[PDB]
């Protein structure tokens, strides 16, 4: 059709079909796959806590927020030798003071971050 | 009030967050506890 761009869903990657018209009587079609990224609603953070057998009700509650770093249709500019991050997965504290905890035994040091309410 | 303690604290965490995230749109949010099971299920 006359539409400048048609996006074809996969019947592995989505295909964006765009009509390009160099002159008033000549035109051609450029076919481009895009990225087909799925953000996992499962971010691996069993790395945080040992998943105790019992969990008491807490006023505090952690949250996992998915963050698309760039706006819809906005350009992502790539600086040489640096990779572009598109998605950030931050943890939001919601319900608080933070301070260090140090465990020492026979000249050995191990730092910790204690975040409490 | 612009000089209220609430206003000062609210603007403070906006800067702290923006220095991490910025202008991005919140796509979808999930609790930590329900974002751990799904990882276990996939693994």
């Amino acid at each position: 059709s006359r539409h400048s761009g048609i996006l074809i869903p996969p019947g592995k990657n989505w295909i964006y079909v765009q009509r390009i018209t160099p002159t008033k009587k000549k035109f051609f079609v450029l076919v481009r796959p895009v990225a087909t990224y799925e953000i996992a609603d499962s971010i691996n953070l069993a790395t945080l806590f040992p998943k105790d057998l019992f969990r008491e009700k807490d006023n505090i509650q952690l949250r996992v927020f998915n963050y698309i770093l760039y706006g819809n249709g906005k350009p992502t500019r790539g600086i040489s030798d640096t990779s572009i991050q598109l998605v950030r997965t931050c943890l939001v504290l919601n319900w608080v003071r933070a301070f260090f905890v140090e465990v020492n035994t026979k000249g050995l040091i191990r730092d910790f971050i204690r975040i409490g309410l | 009030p612009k000089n209220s303690e609430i206003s000062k604290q609210e603007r403070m965490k906006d800067a702290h967050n923006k220095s991490i995230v910025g202008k991005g749109n919140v796509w979808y949010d999930m609790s930590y506890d329900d974002a751990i099971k799904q990882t276990i299920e996939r693994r």
Partner: peptide
């Protein structure tokens, strides 16, 4: 549940720049 990223290379250049690629 799905987001997309088309790759395009864009160069913004001054009008006086000498372009060695044809349209």
């Amino acid at each position: 549940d799905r987001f997309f990223f088309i790759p395009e290379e864009v160069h913004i250049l001054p009008e006086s720049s000498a372009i060695m690629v044809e349209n």
